[PDB]
């Protein structure tokens, strides 16, 4: 039924994955807030799966910025996966693509996982 389900992938140890359930508005923002402060073993790489996310508002954008800042404070590398052309446009206009780095943004989980594995191997 879902060939790109995280359960169908090989996820390296030290890589955490978080899947967003839909439009990235206040509901998602409240759920993502502080996630890194509640993981005991801080991940080397954190992949935010955004295949279900076509749109993001100011509240979700604020939460994504603070999430990226918590990753930096933790030495965790944030990757975005499943980013559609529409979501990319919104993230770019917000200034997030240039702050994160283009090379950290992927259109598919397989590509993000490939880069995650490379990162852990270093
Ligand atoms: Cl994804």
Automatic annotation (TrEMBL):
Localization terms from the record: Membrane
Stretches assigned to the STAS domain: 14-116
Organism domain of life: Bacteria
Protein name: SULFATE TRANSPORTER SULFATE TRANSPORTER FAMILY PROTEIN
Residue numbers of the full-length protein present here: 440 to 561 of 569
């Amino acid at each position: 039924d879902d060939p790109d389900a995280t359960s169908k992938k090989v996820v390296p140890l030290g890589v955490e994955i978080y899947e967003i359930n839909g439009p990235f508005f206040f509901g998602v923002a409240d759920r993502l807030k502080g996630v890194l402060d509640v993981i005991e073993e801080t991940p080397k790489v954190f992949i935010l799966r955004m295949r279900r996310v076509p749109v993001i508002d100011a509240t979700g954008m604020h939460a994504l910025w603070e999430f990226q800042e918590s990753c930096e404070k933790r030495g965790t590398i944030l990757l975005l996966s499943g980013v559609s052309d529409r979501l990319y446009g919104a993230l770019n206009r917000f200034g997030f693509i240039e702050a994160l780095g283009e090379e950290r943004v992927f259109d598919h989980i397989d590509k993000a996982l490939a880069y995650a594995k490379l990162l852990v191997e270093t």
